[PDB]
């Protein structure tokens, strides 16, 4: 069940920055005291975020 609504105000979206966010664990491999590098789909640093 859905009903049409007209109480929404129109405003352009804002844009802020993504300085040091968007890094996760590439895989469940445990690594200790090592500098590892890998190629996956990642959020770029200092990128535009809506």
């Amino acid at each position: 069940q859905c009903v049409n609504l007209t109480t929404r105000t129109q405003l352009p979206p804002a844009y802020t920055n993504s300085f040091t966010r968007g890094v996760y664990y590439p895989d469940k491999v445990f690594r200790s005291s090592v500098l590892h590098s890998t190629q996956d789909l990642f959020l770029p640093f200092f990128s535009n975020v809506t």
């Binding site: 664990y25 469940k28 491999v29 445990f30 690594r31 200790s32």
Partner: peptide
């Protein structure tokens, strides 16, 4: 060593 719950094997 201590392992995080989501980890499976170490390298």
């Amino acid at each position: 060593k201590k392992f995080l719950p989501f980890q499976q094997f170490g390298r």
